[PDB]
């Protein structure tokens, strides 16, 4: 058997090589090529690079898009992502809300 993950569970003998090309054929799913964009974005704004983004740091991210938040606003925006309550936002928390 090939080390290749997932090959074909069906197909007894009398069959070309097509499994389900009459239903969907080509699969629909954005390649991780888009995921790497998630990091480089908010991750670079992390001046400490500790892997977490604080309020003062996140305040530099929003302004970049064209939304400059005040010292009073960047506080309520960070609590929207920070569900665990660590003062900073973790990759995962932001990676899920970035997708379906
Ligand atoms: Ca930081
Ligand atoms: Ca958090």
Domain 1-100: give its CATH architecture: Orthogonal Bundle (1.10)
What is the 33 CA–ligand 2 centroid distance (Å)? 24
Experimentally, how was this structure solved? NMR
Q: Is 90 part of any known ligand binding site?
A: no
Measured CA to CA in angstroms, residue 17 lies from 2, 52, 64, 100 at distances of 16, 48, 50, 32
Residues 19, 30: Cα–Cα separation, whole Å: 22
Do 93 and 83 meet the contact criterion of CB atoms below 8 Å apart? yes
Rounded Cα distance between 45 and 41, Å, is 7
Integer angstrom CA distances of residue 75 from 21, 50, 70, 82, 87: 51, 20, 9, 11, 9
Asked if residue 86 belongs to a known ligand binding site, the reply is yes
Question: Are the C-beta atoms of residues 42 and 53 closer than 8 Å to each other?
Answer: yes
Q: Which ligand is nearest to the CA of 58?
A: 1
Q: Are 82 and 88 in contact (CB under 8 A)?
A: yes
Distance set, CA 59 to CA 8, 30, 36, 76, 79 (Å): 50, 29, 22, 11, 13
Ligand that lies nearest to the alpha carbon of residue 92, given by its number in the listed order: 2
What sign results for the dihedral spanned by CA atoms 48, 49, 51, 57? positive
Let me know: does 15 contact 7? Beta carbons within 8 Å. Answer: no
């Amino acid at each position: 058997m090939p080390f290749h993950p997932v090959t074909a569970a069906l197909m007894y003998r009398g069959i070309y090589t097509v499994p389900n090309l009459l239903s969907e054929q080509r699969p629909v799913d954005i390649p991780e090529d888009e995921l790497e964009e998630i990091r480089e974005a908010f991750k670079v704004f992390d001046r400490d690079g500790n892997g977490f983004i604080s309020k003062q740091e996140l305040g530099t991210a929003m302004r970049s898009l064209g939304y400059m938040p005040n010292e009073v606003e960047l506080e309520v925006i960070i609590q929207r992502l920070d569900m665990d309550g660590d003062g900073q936002v973790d990759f995962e928390e932001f990676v899920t809300l970035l997708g379906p």
